[PDB]
């Protein structure tokens, strides 16, 4: 059978297949062990087995193909690639490899690759002639990712406000500064739904770090793209691993001239994970943050760019403030001036039970004239002039009232014009 | 005539064969048998080649043209048609 | 008869029982020795003897059926189970096994499990086909646990205000933040009494870590459900060992579509116990707590969830703040954004002898609209709007005054409005 | 008809004998003697079975049908059907 759909079937359905096949006592072990067991039994019949995954090269030299269903968690069912294969095909970590697999031999504990017939959704000899991501020249974003769905629903109101405040383009590097309770999660979900509907071609990845287990489940059911998360009960090295896999996988897709969007929640929790893992260097900043700890989170955030050739990489990360931790404040200080887009959520607007709780005055984008047209930019400047005197709570209440009556931002500008 | 790459396990068998310099016996599609040692694995123009020191001249042959190979240390290996 | 009945049998009663059946000597006061002898005579006569306990598999391969009365402490009377039986029936740590019990063989210190007929309160064949806890998909808590009793007594005020401040649902990962002196133990007792009376079906477990023996004695009397505790004089390894027994026992019950509620006192003490038992990871952060030390407690705390298939596990843990030591506060900072419900206790309200000293403005859950009905949530929002400008100390006085003359919160809402 | 699991101690004795290749003497309900070699214990369809390679036949039979088992090296006891 194909390994990819086995990892998608429910655990209860796997038990029925395993018992039917001939296995027993597989109802009291983890899903990875169940999948490995049924694959082992099927391999004894001599039938070919197809598997796929994302390559992760270890420091020793060999690598494993890990699946996004388990959030790239190491397990018995992971496929093993020999160092020669990584040298035969010019394979880097993050490459998506598909092909046939074989059962482990004596002294082997993992399934091994048998025949590679697809690398990064392309022929193996064509994927090895792609220029590396580091060699691509960054550019300012010039293609607009319009969040406005235009159906006039209440959940579409957040998308319309987002277009007015901070336009988002392909290759943007945005930050969402949020207090502890400002509807941050629903803001990300609204963005993900807008991306899936308006731009089905763009590859969407949602990355969650130190997330509660129940929050992960609802995100996977809602987001149309791919959701990879690490719960807070997992070790700090696990948070780093999943983040490295996502960014490397995104880079490989961009090398094939694809638009990749990464929604990160949160850059603060990612930085704290790196602080734990990175060895101390003796230069500890305020709040107990190592100086070299933040070098790697910035590399993750700094990869967002608009490639001059085909492709783009958009990263929209959330930064946590007012959490009562000195470490969180220090982390946000270093990431303050690094983003093209800034979107500020206001606690007080949320306390008034008004959503989206967006601080319009403090949120904007750099070089926004490239994303929008000429006439639309003039209308946006008119709106910002009106909003500027108003207070943060008053502005959002006023803004939603004028948007509720209209159905599209074009109509909203026309009504506001007269 | 396109080139059909060999399976990963078969390639690994030749890969460590070059490292240990085995005097493996090579059998081709036409039935030509030779006893030589593979120096290394070289791939050019997206086509993989095997270089062996038969007759002391370092002949080069395609991977897919090899039918079988064996050594006294590692049993007979038959490459799949796929 | 069974071993369990002889455990709690009064010393005078068992002497009367022993003399009539034909026990030769009963002058000795050692309870374990005499109950050992009567079982041996029963075995010689062929009389069947039964026993029960909670399995605890050790790293060697075999385990013992510990008893909840002794707080799962290792003892001579613990029933030994061979590793062959562990392989025969799929047994994990925490399973409760009841069945025939064999007297110890010559050279064996402990009794051996003669036969097992009921595991986890179900037939052995059916209990081996239960999906593992890790394979269950978490969900947000939807069905709530009402604790507003209709008695109307003075103790019911603490339950009623807790219902208004922060609802509790099935699978809620609640957290209690308390200063050193805020009447914390009273709050746990009120919840435990409320849970037992309102929800008899839900299994209730109370876990106490580093607790004085006098507190354990009264807690067991008050709480109807099982109470397990470890005294402070015991080594730190005991606190870790008892914690594993409680959580693993809960997980096995949840696999049987059971709702399990765990009250923890406290997560701060449990974190300290794990800190001193784990090997040093080479990197130590502020407060002298190892980075990998906190991984294990998060596994305990993060297990609380609402299983989609059926059943739930509710963990409500207490945390201590501003207790002098900075180790306590860094532990709380690590567990801050990890719980669904957050209930705060204020010292300045406790000093004024106003109980319960909860901070209404700084406590609450995350998704109240799932636990409460549509109408109740609006009333809570209206009440929250009134309380919000008020200070923490005066708000409680406002709450207790208006909750004194109201029998039920529904009547309180009618009184509150207009 | 319905299979009844044997006692744990009876299960252990066969388990320890089969795990270190100990010859076992079979006594069934009918009363026939089957002195042969037992390999291990296999459980299928929630029913425990014992496989005995009597002259290579590798016969498989239910555990509850065994009346008793005897051996000089280990303790000789009779299972209880209750
Ligand atoms: N657009 C919205 N419409 C209605 N309610 C909202 C909206 N955004 C946020 N909320 C409310 O604010 C709360 C914020 O929860 P959530 O966003 O899940 O966590 P966080 O704010 O930490 O990201 C939710 O309980 C939700 O009821």
Q: 3-state SS string over chain C?
A: CEHHHHHCCCHHHHHHHHHHHCCCCCCCCCHHHHHHHHHHHHHHHCCCCEEEEEEEECCCCCEEEECCCCCCCCCCCCEEECHHHHHHCCCCCCCEEEEEEECCCCCCCCCEECCCCEECCECHHHHCCCCCHHHCCEECCCCECCCCCCCCCCCHHHHHHHHHHCCCECCCCCEEEECCCCCHHHHHHHHHHHHHHHCCCCEEEEEEEEECHHHHHHHHHHCCCEEEEEECCCCHHHHHHHHHHHHHHHHHHHCCCCEEEEEEECHHHHHHHHHHHCCCCCCECCCCCECHHHHHHHHHHCCCEEECCCCEEEEEEEEECCCCCHHHHHHHHHCHHHCCCEEEECHHHHCCCCCCCECHHHCECCCHHHHCCHHHHHHHHHHHHHHCCCCHHHHHHHHHHHHHCCCCHHHHHHHHCC
CATH number for the domain whose boundaries are C1-126: 2.40.50.140
Long-range CB contacts for residues B58-62, cutoff 8 Å, separation at least 24: B61/B26, B61/B28, B62/B3
Ligand 1 nearest atom to the CA of residue A187, by list position? 8
Selecting from C88, C100, C125 the residue whose C-beta is nearest the C-beta of D11 gives C88
The first and second tokens of residue A227, run together, are: 């959701």
Candidate of A183, A320, A400 to mutate for ligand 1, largest count of ligand atoms within 8 Å of Cβ = A183
Q: Which of C340, C367, C380 to mutate to test the pocket of ligand 1 (most atoms within 8 A of CB)?
A: C367
Among C298, C208, C205, C296, residue whose Cα is nearest residue C252: C205
Q: Helix, strand, coil % (nearest 5) of chain A?
A: 40, 20, 40
Give which of D3, D9, D74 to mutate to test C binding, by max C Cβ within 10 Å. D9
Domains C1-126 and C129-417 share a fold: no
Round to whole Å and give the CA distance between C191 and C189.
Answer: 5
Quick one: which of C152, C72, C176 has its CA closest to C411?
C152
Of C90, C295, C301, the CB nearest to A28: C90
- Name the residue with tokens 């070289």: B42
Nearest to A255 by CA among A117, A99, A96: A96
CA-to-CA distance for C383 and C368, rounded, in angstroms? 14
A186 is in an annotated binding site: yes
Q: What resolution in angstroms, rounded to 1 decimal?
A: 2.7
Cβ-based neighbours of A61, under 8 Å, separated by 6 or more: A83, A86
Does C174 appear as a known binding residue? yes
Give the residue, by CA position, lying nearest to ligand 1 atom 2. A355
Closest ligand 1 atom number to CA of residue C367? 25
Q: What residue of A is the nearest CA neighbor of C298? A: A233
CA-nearest residue for atom 26, ligand 1, is A183
Which residues sit with their C-beta closer than 6 Å to ligand 1? A 158, 181-186, 355-356; C 367
SS3 B55: helix
**Cβ A115–B43 below 8 Å, yes or no?**
no
Contact indicator for C210, C230 with CB cutoff of 8 Å: yes
3-state secondary structure of A352: coil
- Dist CA A115 CA C116 (whole Å): 50
Report how far residue A87's alpha carbon sits from residue A85's, in angstroms, rounded to the nearest whole number.
5
Helix, strand, coil shares of chain B, percent, nearest 5, are 20, 40, 45
Tell whether C189 is in a known binding site: no
Query: How many Å apart are CA C51 and CA B12, to the nearest integer?
Result: 59
Is C286 a known ligand-binding residue?
A: no
The residue extents of the domains of chain C are 1-126, 129-417
Q: Which of C166, C366, C381 best tests ligand 1's pocket when mutated (most atoms within 8 Å of CB)?
A: C366
**Contact state of A214 with C138 under an 8 Å Cβ cutoff:** yes
Q: Which ranges in A107-223 belong to alpha helices (H)?
A: 124-127, 156-165, 184-198, 213-222
What letter would DSSP give residue A132?
Answer: P
> By three-state DSSP, how is residue D38 classified?
strand
Measured between alpha carbons, how far is A159 from A394 in angstroms, rounded to an integer?
19
Closest by alpha carbon to C252, among C151, C375, C136, C157? C136
Q: Scanning every residue of chain C, which has its alpha carbon at the shortest distance from the alpha carbon of A328? A: C333
**A365 among annotated binding-site residues:** no
Q: Which of C246, C141, C149 is nearest to C195 (CA)?
A: C149
Burial of D56 (0-12, 13-18, 19+ CB in 10 A): exposed
Gyration radius of chain D's alpha carbons? 12
C-alpha of D75 from chain center: 14
Q: Report cis status (omega within 30 of 0) of the bond before C367.
A: no
Select from C90, C282, C336 the Cβ nearest to the Cβ of A25.
C90
CA distance linking residue B5 with residue C111, whole number of Å: 64
Which chain A residues are Cβ-neighbours of C140 within 8 angstroms? 214, 218
> What number of other Cβ atoms are within 10 A of residue C60's Cβ?
7
List the structure tokens of A262: 């990464």
Cα A357 to Cα C39: distance, rounded to the nearest angstrom: 71
Cα separation of A59 and A63, whole Å? 9
Nearest to A52, CA basis, from A79, A33, A75: A79
- Exposure pattern of A142-172 as b/e (b: 16+ CB <10 Å)? eebbbbbbeeeeeebbbbbbbbbbbbbbbbb
User: Which of these, A380, A317, A347, lies nearest to A160 by C-alpha position?
Assistant: A380
Q: Tell me the HSE value of C16 on the side-chain side, using a 13 A CA sphere.
A: 5
**Structure token digits, residue C308:** 């989609």
Phi, psi of A118 (to 5 degrees): -160, 120
**CB D26, CB D69: distance < 8 Å:** yes
Please give the backbone phi and psi of residue B31, each rounded to the nearest 5 degrees, phi first: 95, 20
Distance, CA of A415 to chain centre: 37
Question: Looking up tokens 């002195």, which residue turns up?
Answer: D35
For residues A131 and C236, what is the distance between their CA atoms, to the nearest angstrom?
Answer: 57
Task: Evaluate the omega torsion of the peptide bond into residue A299 and state whether it is cis, within 30 degrees of 0.
Answer: no
Pocket test for ligand 1, best of A186, A353, A404 (most atoms within 8 A of CB): A186
**Residue of chain A minimizing CA distance to C142:** A214
- Is the preceding omega at residue A356 within 30 degrees of 0, hence cis? yes
Is A28 labelled as part of a ligand binding site?
Answer: no
How many Å apart are CA A70 and CA A241, to the nearest integer?
13
Distance CA A412, CA A137 (A): 38
Q: A-chain residues within 8 Å CB-CB of B82?
A: 115
Give contacts of A112 with chain B, Cβ < 8 Å. 8-9
Q: Is A171 among the annotated ligand-binding positions?
A: yes
- A190 Cα nearest atom in ligand 1: 1
Q: Scanning every residue of chain D, which has its alpha carbon at the shortest distance from the alpha carbon of C48?
A: D82
- Which of B7, B15, B48 has its CB closest to that of A114? B7
Say if CB C306 and CB C312 are below 8 A apart: yes
Give whole-number Cα distances, A329 to A181, A326, A334, A363, C362, in Å.
16, 5, 9, 19, 21
The helix (H) or strand (E) run that includes residue A272 is helix A267-277
> Which residues partner with C229 through β-bridges?
C208
| Pairing status of strand B47-52 against strand B38-44 | antiparallel
Atom 15, ligand 1: which residue's CA is nearest? A183
Write out the H or E segment, with its range, that includes residue A416.
helix A409-417
User: In 3-state terms, what secondary structure has residue A17?
Assistant: helix
D interface test, pick of C47, C88, C112 with most D CB neighbours within 10 Å:
C88
What are all long-range contacts of A230-237, with beta carbons under 8 Å and residues at least 24 apart? Answer: A230/A71, A231/C302, A232/C298, A232/C302, A232/C338, A233/C295, A233/C298, A233/C299, A233/C301, A233/C302, A233/C303, A234/C295, A235/C292, A235/C295, A236/A273, A236/A276, A236/A277, A236/C291, A236/C292, A237/A277
Listed residue (A23, A46, A45, A44) closest to A35, CA to CA = A23
User: Rounded distance, CA B39 to CA B21, Å?
Assistant: 7
Partner-chain contact B7 A85, CB within 8 Å: no
Interatomic CA distance for residues C259 and C306, integer angstroms:
9
The helix/strand/coil state of A363 is coil
Residue owning the nearest CA to atom 12 of ligand 1: A183
Q: Which residue of B has its CA nearest to A113?
A: B8
Counting CB pairs under 8 A, whether chains C and D reach 3 or more, is yes
- Backbone phi and psi for residue B2, each to the nearest 5 degrees, phi listed first: -75, 165
Q: What is the CATH number of domain A129-417?
A: 3.40.50.300
Beta bridge partners of A230: A209
- Report CB contact under 8 Å: A115, B7: yes
Distance from C-alpha of A157 to C-alpha of C391, rounded to nearest angstrom: 35
């Amino acid at each position: 059978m194909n390994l990819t759909e086995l990892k998608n079937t429910p655990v209860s359905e796997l038990i029925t297949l395993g018992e039917n096949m001939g296995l027993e006592n597989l109802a009291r072990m983890r899903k990875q062990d169940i999948i490995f067991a049924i694959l082992k039994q099927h391999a004894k019949s001599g039938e070919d087995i197809f598997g796929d995954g994302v390559l992760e090269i270890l420091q020793d030299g060999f690598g494993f193909l890990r699946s996004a269903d388990s959030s790239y968690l190491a397990g018995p069912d992971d496929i093993y690639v020999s160092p020669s294969q990584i040298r035969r095909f010019n394979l880097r970590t993050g490459d998506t490899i598909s092909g046939k697999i074989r059962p482990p031999k004596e002294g082997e504990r993992y399934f091994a690759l048998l025949k590679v017939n697809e690398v990064n959704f392309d022929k193996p000899e064509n994927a090895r002639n792609k220029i590396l991501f580091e060699n691509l020249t960054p550019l300012h974003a010039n293609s607009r990712l319009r969040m406005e769905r235009g159906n006039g629903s209440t959940e579409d109101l957040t998308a319309r406000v987002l277009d007015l405040a901070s336009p988002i383009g392909r290759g943007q590097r945005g930050l969402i500064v949020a207090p502890p309770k400002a509807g941050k999660t629903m803001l990300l979900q609204n963005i993900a739904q807008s991306i899936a509907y308006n731009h089905p071609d763009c590859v969407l990845m949602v990355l969650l770090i130190d997330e509660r287990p129940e929050e992960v489940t609802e995100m996977q059911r809602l987001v149309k793209g791919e959701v990879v998360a690490s719960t807070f009960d997992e070790p700090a090295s696990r948070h780093v691993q999943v983040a490295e896999m996502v960014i490397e996988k995104a880079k490989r897709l961009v090398e094939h001239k694809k638009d990749v969007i990464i929604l990160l929640d949160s850059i603060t929790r990612l930085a704290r994970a790196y602080n734990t893992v990175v060895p101390a260097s003796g230069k500890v900043l305020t709040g107990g943050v190592d100086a070299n700890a933040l070098h790697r989170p910035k590399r993750f955030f700094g990869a967002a760019r608009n490639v001059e050739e085909g492709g783009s990489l958009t990263i929209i990360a959330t930064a946590l403030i007012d959490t009562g931790s000195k470490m969180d404040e220090v982390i946000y200080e270093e990431f303050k001036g690094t983003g093209n887009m800034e979107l500020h959520l206001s606690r007080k607007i949320a306390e008034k039970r008004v959503f989206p709780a967006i601080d319009y005055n403090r949120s904007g984008t750099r070089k926004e004239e490239l994303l929008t047209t000429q006439e639309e930019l003039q209308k946006m400047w008119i709106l910002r002039k009106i909003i500027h005197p108003m207070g943060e709570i008053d502005a959002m209440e006023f803004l939603i009232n004028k948007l509720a009556m209209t159905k599209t931002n074009d109509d909203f500008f026309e009504m506001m014009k007269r | 005539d396109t080139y059909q790459p060999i399976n990963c396990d078969d390639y690994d068998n030749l890969e460590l064969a070059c490292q240990h310099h085995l005097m493996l016996t090579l059998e081709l599609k036409d039935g030509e048998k030779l006893q030589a040692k593979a120096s290394d694995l070289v791939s050019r123009k997206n086509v993989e080649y095997l270089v062996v020191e038969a007759a002391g001249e370092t002949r080069e042959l395609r991977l897919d043209k090899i039918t079988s190979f064996s050594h006294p240390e590692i049993g007979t290996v038959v490459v799949s048609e796929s």
